[PDB]
Every structure is written in C-alpha cells, then in structure tokens.
Design a protein around this ligand. Structure first.
Ligand SMILES: [Cl-]
Ligand SMILES: [Zn+2]
Length: 429
C-alpha cells in the first residue's frame, strides 16, 4: 500500500522519470532542470509546497501518495546563482510541518564546442567555449595532466579560462572538464602535433618555386616573437608580404605560400585520422595572428592542391573571411595567436553535387590524384556576395565590394586534426 507509512516526512530516494529511457524509473543522485522526478519516502499525504533550491515548484496533488509523489524541476530553478543557504536542497511543506533534504540540482549537461588556441606554449592562456561550463573544478589535458588551480569560469557558463600546464602529451586529444553541471569533452584536436603539415621549424617543408610577385619565398618568413597571450612559435608566414603592398582593389592569388608537395610531403593517411572518418569529423587547423583590425575586403584561400587560379568558390579549397560573421561586417582582430578550424565538410568539394567528399579517404584520394599535391594558402582581395558563402539564392543581393588593402596576417602550424568528441552521458547503455 502506497498510502501507508508514518505522518513524519522522510525522503528515502529520488528517481528520474523518463519514458525514452532503458531504466524509465531510475534511482539518481542529482536531477537536472526540466526533469520529472519521483520522490520516494513517507508522510507525503497532505503535501502543500515543494521548494527546489528555494524555488516554489508546482506539483500535481492527485499524483501524491503517502510514500511517493511526482514533481518537475522547473526551468526557472536557480543553480549556480541560487542562495548558498538553499542551494542543493529540496524542502517539503505541509500543515503539520516541514522537511529539508540535501540533493544536487544541475542545469543541462555541459558542452565544449571550441578551444581558443589548440597549440599553445606552456603557461599561456587558453579560453574554452561552450555551454554550462559553470564552476569548473578540474581540467584534464591529453596525457592525464590534471589542473584544479587557476580555472576561471563564466558566471553564465559560456566559457572558462585556464593556463597551459607542462607535460601535455604530444599525441594530443580531447580536454576533459568537471564542473557543477557535470563532465564534458572537447573535440579530440588539442595539442595534435602528429597531424602537423608545416610549422616552418622542421615539421614538414616549405615549397618555393619561380619569381612571381605573389610567391612567398623561403627567405621571406618572419620569426620575431609577436602576439599577446598566445605568442608566435619559431618562424611563421606573413601574408601578404610588405613588398606586395598595397594589394589591388580587385585581384586574386595576391600572395601564396605552400608545402613542398609532390615528393616530400607525408602520406596524410599516417596523421592519425582513419580513412573512414566523415568530413564533418576531421579538419585543417592553423593558428592565425591579425594584430590590426581586418574588414571590408581580403580573404584567405586554403588550397588542398596547387590547381587554383584564385577567386574560386568551387573545388577542394576554402575561403576564410573572418570579418563576415552572420552576413555582417565585424572587424577581425586577435590579441595573440588563435586556432582556426576548417572541417573538411566546410570545403566546397564536400558541398558538391556529384563527386562530393564524404570521408577522409575521399580527401586522400583527391591529393593522390592531384597534379601538384602542394598544400598551401592564398591571400585574395576580390568582391564578395553573401550567397557564395551560404545559400545560393537568398543572400545573392548582399555585396561586400573589395577595396585596396595593406592588412597584415600571420599563419602557422598547418595540420590535419580529428574532430571526434568522446561520448559523456549521465547514464550510458
Ligand atoms: Cl607544448
Ligand atoms: Zn612556427
């Protein structure tokens, strides 16, 4: 009998009610906002109020039995912003008395969607973005490098800050965190030195040929320490070069830098990304430094192969226009070196109608069949229409006319990375 038991309130266990779960009535040690919980115990007959973290939560009195009742954890219940004296409590009120019970209340599980710099130096600042990243207590780096000190979390849990510790594995991988809302993994692309194509300091080789005005020679790199927070590492490429300025109001292939290509470049199948990996789960990464604001005109063309004339929006290439956020001009500037992730899915060849890219094997096939396997970049200063970036009809009218430019951009650590994010669920199958 559910209507039996004493008149003195008591909670013995809290269960999560989920119709879409393998354990639809599951005994739990925490509850999240929006969840329906079943509170089991005694003396619940005549229940009048339920407060969760001091917030009055509606409950249906007809679902109340003396040993069990159902209550939804209202979306407006405060968690990290709840008063310390009521935080993580369930209080029950009836005419004959009240009962307080210590129980952990969380918001949605945390998520890491982006790391500001995926190849920092020891002691440099890192910004990790996502959601629900409130009160981060632990950050773990590839190689089981544990950090519990110097973690500053956003009050709104959109980010946290932490310095790069010593001893992080050169194999790289995901970062892992523990905060008030639980655990989360980043994509597996942090400190991924095994995917390095070119760093201009001995990993890979710069390819240079001819005497063209656009050609960046091996003798035309920079090595002075530049950037605040994330500082340059060894030599890197400046593009466009000082000698190439000012770059013409409407021109393409204005500046170019490449890998050695045909002959010495590695087999990309040896960079730790399996052939079967989908194009949305692997990418090209590089660190960028834009000291002065960049807007109105100019863009970077990542060339998967040498066969590009300049000004394309079509094959195994990608046009990085960082001053166009949501079809809106927003000046682009970095305090220091920041990682740029370009999934192979974002490449125009992966968005093609026929021989479209589906996996990394399709990327390796293309580079093996390419006339010139030089991986590289183009600085480009030609006219833009928001459709060439997004939807081929709706944004066709919006134009961003190209102008003369003398913008300074620096790139480094070109690499292939995996974007696979390990699974983290409250209760796995
Ligand atoms: Cl390091
Ligand atoms: Zn370098």
């Amino acid at each position: 009998d559910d209507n039996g038991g004493s008149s003195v309130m008591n909670i013995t266990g809290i269960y999560l009610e989920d119709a879409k779960s393998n354990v639809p009535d599951r005994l739990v040690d925490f509850a999240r906002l929006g969840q329906l919980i079943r509170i089991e115990g005694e003396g619940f007959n005549g229940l009048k109020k339920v407060y969760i973290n001091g917030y009055n939560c509606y409950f249906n009195p007809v679902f109340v039995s003396n040993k069990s009742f159902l209550v939804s954890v209202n979306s407006k219940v405060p968690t990290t912003e709840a008063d310390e004296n009521v935080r993580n409590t369930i209080r029950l009120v009836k005419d004959g008395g009240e009962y307080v019970y210590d129980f952990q209340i969380r918001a949605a599980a945390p998520s890491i969607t982006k790391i500001s710099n995926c190849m920092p130096n020891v002691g440099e600042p890192i910004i990790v973005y996502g959601s629900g990243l409130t009160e981060i207590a632990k950050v773990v780096f590839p190689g089981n490098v544990v950090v519990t000190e110097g973690i500053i979390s956003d009050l709104d849990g959109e980010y946290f800050m932490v310095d790069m510790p010593a001893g992080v594995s050169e194999e790289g991988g995901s970062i892992f965190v523990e905060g008030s809302n639980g655990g989360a993994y980043s994509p597996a692309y942090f400190n991924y030195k095994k995917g390095l194509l070119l760093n201009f300091d001995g990993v890979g080789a710069q390819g240079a040929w001819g005497d063209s005005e656009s050609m960046i020679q091996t003798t035309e790199l920079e090595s002075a320490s530049i950037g605040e927070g994330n500082v340059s590492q060894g030599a890197y490429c400046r593009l466009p070069l000082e000698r190439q300025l000012p770059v013409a109001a409407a021109k393409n292939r204005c500046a170019e830098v490449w890998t050695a290509g045909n002959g010495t470049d590695p087999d990309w199948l040896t960079l730790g990304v399996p052939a079967e990996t989908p194009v949305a789960e692997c990418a090209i990464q590089f660190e960028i430094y834009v000291p002065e604001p960049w807007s109105e005109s100019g863009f970077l063309k990542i060339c998967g192969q040498n066969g590009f004339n300049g000004g394309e929006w079509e094959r195994d290439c990608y046009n990085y226009v960082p001053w166009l956020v949501d079809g809106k001009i927003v000046p682009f500037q970095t305090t220091g070196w920041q990682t740029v992730t370009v999934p192979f899915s974002e490449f125009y060849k992966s968005k093609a109608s026929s021989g479209a890219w589906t996996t990394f094997a399709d990327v390796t096939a293309t580079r093996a069949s390419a006339s010139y396997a030089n991986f590289g970049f183009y600085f480009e200063n030609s006219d833009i229409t928001l459709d060439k970036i997004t939807g081929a009809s709706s944004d066709k009218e919006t134009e961003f006319l190209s102008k003369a430019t003398s913008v300074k951009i620096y790139i480094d650590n070109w690499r292939v990375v995996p974007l696979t994010k390990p699974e983290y669920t409250d209760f796995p199958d």
